[PDB]
C-alpha cells in the first residue's frame, strides 16, 4: 500500500505475539525487512518470521529483554548486520498486572515501569543514535495506550508508564525534528490479542469492555498494524510528536453517551 | 493507494483553493467522486474539477456559503443527486483576520465563528443525518488547526472557533460511534497554501514561521491531503474522535528546543 | 479569607441564580463590591444584593442580556459608575438544552453559542479594554464546564461553546499576561443549583449522576464560589490561562473505576 | 488563611530547600504540624524547623531518601509517632540534569525516574494506605512541572517522570475518590529557588527564561506554596485529579505571542 516502505528496515519489540506480531506481518505485506524481537521462551517467533516472509517481506528473529541495555543494542545491531541499516524502530513490548495502588509492591511497579517505559526509552535512544550518526531520516513508533490519558485504577504502574511514554515521545520528537526524525505514539483501546483471549472468553467481561467502547466492538490487531504502517510511511511526513488513538472512541468518555 | 476509497462520494467545503483543493485532487487520485463546494465564481472551481478527473476521479462543482443553512443542505443534496449517495463529508471552509482581542469587533468574531465552527456544525449535521437515515457507515473530517490547542493572540475568534470545533467533533464522534460513523479533526500547522503566499514571500516572515516549526519547513498541501485520505479510508477503521495534528511539531512547544 | 479582595470591584453575569449568586455572596464575605447582573425581572436580584450586603460586601444590581453588546458594555459601566473601577470580571451566564446533534436546530445552536461563548467573549473584551485603558492588573474568570474536555451527546452546542471558551480564555491569557491581567476558567462538574433540582429530585437520575462522580456526591455551589474567590485573589498571582476543574473527579473517566 | 488546616499534619519531601521549604513555612503560617523530610544534614533542616515554628506551626525533621522504600515508610511513621496522625502528604523531592536524549545514560534515567516518579508513587502509596486503614479523608499533593505537558529536550528523563506522575496522580485520585481522599498535582513554571540562583545570576539566562514567561517574571517560591495550601484545604473540597499550573503562562505557548 505504501510504496516507500518497500525495502525499509523495521525492528519491532514484543513481535512474537499480539500487536507486535500483527505489525510484523503488515510490514511484511509492505515488503519491508523486519527484525522480530521476542523475549519469552514460549512464543514461536519463527512462525511469525514465516508469516512475514509469506506476506512479501524479509525477517530475522532475535531474542532480547528490553530492560537490558545490551539486549536493546543487539536488536539494533541485528538490523545493521542482517539488512545493512535501520529505518523504523517500534517499541511495543509491554505488560500489566492488577493490584490496589495502596498495596502495589515496588517490585511490580518497577517491572512495569522498566518494561513499558524504560524499555521504550532504550529502544528509542539506540535507534535515534543510529539515525543521527548515519544521517537517516528515521522513524520511531512507541506503543502506548488509551491509558496515557485514561487513568487506570489497579494499574497505576501501567498508567504511569504510558503517561511517561507520552512525554518521552514528545520530547524526542521535539529534540530530533530538525534532523527529520519523527517520533510518535499509537494509543490502542481494547484489542483482541491472544494475551486478552482469557479475559474476553468470559462473556461478561467481553460485554463490559464492549460497553466502554462507543463503536461497540473490540478492535482487531490489524486495525493497529494499519496505523503503524501509515505513521512509518512518508504519507505521515509532517506528523511528529503525536499520539494517534485507535480506540473505537474510548478516550471520548463512554459514561457520557446519551443511551 | 486506498482501494476502498474508489467510487466513494466525498463532499468538500472550501474546495476551490488551498487545502480543500489539495484534498479534492488527492481524492481524485484515490478514484473517488468529489463534490467541490466553492464560494465565489472568481475561484475557478472547474479547474479543480478537471484536475480531480485528470488524477483519476469524478467531480462536480456547487456554489455555497457554509454560513447559510440552505446552502449547506444543498451541498449534501448535490452529492446525492449527482452521484447517488454520500460517504465522506469534509468541512474545510474557514477564514481568519488579526485584531487585538480587546478591540475585536463583534462582526469579525461572528463571521469567524459562523464560518469556521457553525459552518462545520451544519455540514456535519447534514452529512450525519443522511448517514443515519440510510444506514451508511459514513465519515466526517473537520479541518481544525494547531490553534485548537495553541492559543492565538490577535486571532481570539479563530482560536475559539477551533477549540469549539474540537469538542463538537468529539461529541459527534461519541454520539454516532454506535452507528459506525466516524468523526475526526485534522490539525495542520503552517502550510504553504496560496492564501499564505504573500506572507511567505517576505523572507523575514517565512524565516520567523520556520523558526516555530521543529521539523524546520512549512508543510505542503499534499501532506495534509494525505492525512484526509487515510482518515477517510478503512485503514482508520478504529479511529474516531481524534485530532490528527500534522504540524512539523508546532504543538510540541518550539520555544523549549535545546538549540 | 483573602484580605486583598476587600474593596475590589467584581462584576458577575448570571448572578441572580445558582453559581453566579453563590459567587456574589462569597465575594460579599470577602468584603468586595459586587455588580450583580441579572437577566429577567422574574428573578429576584435584590435578594442576592441583600445577601451580599449581609455577608459583608457592597452590591448593585443591573439587568442585562449578554447576547447584546450594549448590555455587556453597560455591565462594565455600572461597575465604573457605582464603584469607581472594575477589578474582576466573571462571565458566568449560560444555558443548555438536549437535542440529538443530527436533529439540533440552528436556532438552538445559535442561542447556546451566543449566550455561553459570545457572551463571555463580549464580557472579557469589555473588561480587558477597561483594564488596558486604565493600567489595571485585572482578573477575568470564565465559567466553563467539565464539557470543555468531556464530550456531551445531545449537547453538542454546549460542548462546542465551552471548548471554544477554553481557547478564548487561553488566547486572552497569553495576549494580556504581559500587562499583569490574568484570565482563567473554572470547570464545574455536577453542582446542586436550583436549575438542576428537577433532575436530582428524581432519585434514579440523582443516583445515575452520582455514579459518574468518583467522589460520590453532587457538589454544592459554595464549592465553586471557593474556586472563584481563590483565582481572583493574589494567592493565584502566578496562575493564568488555566482551567481549574472542580468536578469530584468526573474528568478522570468514571467508567474506568475498579468498582 | 485556611482555618481547617490548623492542627493538620502535613509531611513534605525535599522540605529542606526551595519549594519544599517554602511549603513547610506556609503550612506553618496555617498553624499546621509539619514533618520536614530532608536528604542530607549538609542541608540545615533545623533552620527550616525553626522558621516553621516562627511562622506559627509545629515541626519535626526526618532524614530520608525517597528512592528507599523503608525511608518513605519512616516519613509517614514519623508523622504518626510525633503528631498522632497524617492528614496531607506532599511528594516534592526531585532532580534533573541535561543530556542529549540519544546519549542519555540509563543510570541518569533511572535516578530521575526513581526520585521524581517512583519516589512520589511510594509516598502517595504509604500515605493513602494510612488514610484507608484509619478512615482519614486525607490529601496528597504531588509536585510536578510544566514538563508534564511541555516536552523538554535534554531532559527526557524528567519529562517522562512528570508525564508519568500526572497519570499516577489521576489514577490514585480516581481509585480513592470514593473514600474522600483527594490527589492533585501542582505544575510550576520557572521559580526562583536557590538551586536556580546560579543560572538566574547570569543576566542573559535570566532574560532568556523571562522571554518564555508571558507574565514576564520568574515566580517566587511563596507563589507555589500558596497553591499547595489551597489544594490541601477544604476550599478545594471538590477538586481532585487535577494539575494546577502556576507558571506565569508558560503552558500557553510563548512563541505564539502577538509580538
Ligand atoms: N491489546 C490491547 O488491548 C492493548 C491496549 C493498549 C495497549 N497495548 C499495548 O500494546 C503492546 C502489545 O500488547 P499486546 O496486546 O500485543 O500483548 P502481548 O502481551 O502479546 O504483547 C507484549 C509482548 O511484549 C513481550 N515482552 C514483555 N516483556 C518483555 C521484555 N522485557 N523484553 C522483550 N519483550 C517483552 C511479551 O513477551 C509479548 O510478546 C503493549 O505495549 C501493550 O501495553 C495493548
Ligand atoms: N494553510 C494553513 O496553514 C492552515 C493552517 C491551519 C488550518 N488551516 C485551515 O484549513 C482550511 C483551509 O485553509 P487554506 O489554507 O486552504 O486557506 P483558504 O483561505 O484558501 O481556504 C479557505 C476556503 O474556504 C472558503 N470559504 C470561506 N468562507 C466561506 C463560506 N462562508 N462559505 C464557503 N466557503 C467559504 C474560501 O473561499 C476558501 O476557498 C481552513 O479551515 C483553515 O482555517 C489552514
Ligand atoms: N450547575 C452545574 O452543574 C454546572 C456545571 C457546569 C457548568 N455550569 C455553568 O455555570 C454557569 C451558571 O449555571 P448555573 O448552574 O448556575 O445555572 P442557572 O441557570 O441558575 O444560571 C445561569 C444564569 O444565566 C442567566 N442567563 C441566561 N441567559 C442569559 C443571557 N442571555 N444574558 C444574561 N444572563 C443570562 C440565567 O438567567 C441564570 O441566572 C453556566 O455558564 C453553566 O453552563 C453549571
Ligand atoms: N524551581 C523550579 O523552577 C521548579 C519548576 C518546576 C518543578 N520543580 C520541582 O519542584 C520540586 C522542588 O525543586 P526545587 O526548585 O525546590 O529544587 P531543589 O533541588 O532545591 O529541591 C529538591 C529537593 O529534593 C531533595 N531530594 C533530591 N533527591 C532526593 C531523594 N532521593 N530523597 C529525598 N530528597 C531528595 C533535594 O535534596 C532538595 O531538598 C522538584 O520536584 C522539582 O522538579 C521546580
Ligand atoms: Cl467515562
Ligand atoms: Cl512555544
TrEMBL record, chains A, B, C, D:
<comment type="subunit">
    <text>Homotetramer.</text>
</comment>
<dbReference type="InterPro" id="IPR050259">
    <property type="entry name" value="SDR"/>
</dbReference>
<protein>
    <recommendedName>
        <fullName>glucose 1-dehydrogenase [NAD(P)(+)]</fullName>
        <ecNumber>1.1.1.47</ecNumber>
    </recommendedName>
</protein>
<keyword id="KW-0560">Oxidoreductase</keyword>
<dbReference type="InterPro" id="IPR036291">
    <property type="entry name" value="NAD(P)-bd_dom_sf"/>
</dbReference>
<dbReference type="GO" id="GO:0047936">
    <property type="term" value="F:glucose 1-dehydrogenase [NAD(P)+] activity"/>
</dbReference>
<dbReference type="InterPro" id="IPR020904">
    <property type="entry name" value="Sc_DH/Rdtase_CS"/>
</dbReference>
<dbReference type="GO" id="GO:0032787">
    <property type="term" value="P:monocarboxylic acid metabolic process"/>
</dbReference>
<comment type="similarity">
    <text>Belongs to the short-chain dehydrogenases/reductases (SDR) family.</text>
</comment>
<dbReference type="InterPro" id="IPR002347">
    <property type="entry name" value="SDR_fam"/>
</dbReference>
<dbReference type="Pfam" id="PF13561">
    <property type="entry name" value="adh_short_C2"/>
</dbReference>
Amino acid at each position: 500500500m505504501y510504496p516507500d516502505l518497500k525495502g525499509k528496515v523495521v525492528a519491532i519489540t514484543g513481535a512474537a505475539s499480539g500487536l507486535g506480531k500483527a505489525m510484523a506481518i503488515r510490514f511484511g505485506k509492505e515488503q519491508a525487512k523486519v527484525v522480530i524481537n521476542y523475549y519469552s521462551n514460549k512464543q514461536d517467533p519463527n512462525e511469525v518470521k514465516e508469516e512475514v516472509i509469506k506476506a512479501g517481506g524479509e525477517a530475522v528473529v532475535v531474542q532480547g529483554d528490553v530492560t537490558k541495555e545490551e539486549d536493546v543494542k543487539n536488536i539494533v545491531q541485528t538490523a545493521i548486520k542482517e539488512f545493512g541499516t535501520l529505518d523504523i524502530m517500534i517499541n511495543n513490548a509491554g505488560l500489566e498486572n492488577p493490584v490496589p495502588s495502596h498495596e502495589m509492591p515496588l517490585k511490580d511497579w518497577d517491572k512495569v515501569i522498566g518494561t513499558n517505559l524504560t524499555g521504550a526509552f532504550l529502544g528509542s535512544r539506540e535507534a535515534i543514535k543510529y539515525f543521527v550518526e548515519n544521517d537517516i531520516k528515521g522513524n520511531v513508533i512507541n506503543m502506548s495506550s488509551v491509558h496515557e490519558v485514561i487513568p487506570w485504577p489497579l494499574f497505576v504502574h501501567y498508567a504511569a508508564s504510558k503517561g511517561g511514554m507520552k512525554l518521552m515521545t514528545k520530547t524526542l520528537a521535539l529534540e530530533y525534528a530538525p534532523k527529520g526524525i519523527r517520533v510518535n505514539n499509537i494509543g490502542p483501546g481494547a484489542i483482541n490479542t491472544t494475551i486478552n483471549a482469557e479475559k474476553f472468553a468470559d462473556p461478561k467481561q467481553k460485554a463490559d469492555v464492549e460497553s466502554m467502547i462507543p463503536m461497540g466492538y473490540i478492535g482487531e490487531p490489524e486495525e493497529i498494524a494499519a496505523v503503524a504502517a501509515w505513521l512509518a510511511s512518508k504519507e505521515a511526513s509532517y506528523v511528529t510528536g503525536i499520539t494517534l488513538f485507535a480506540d473505537g472512541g474510548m478516550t471520548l468518555y463512554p459514561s457520557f453517551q446519551a443511551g
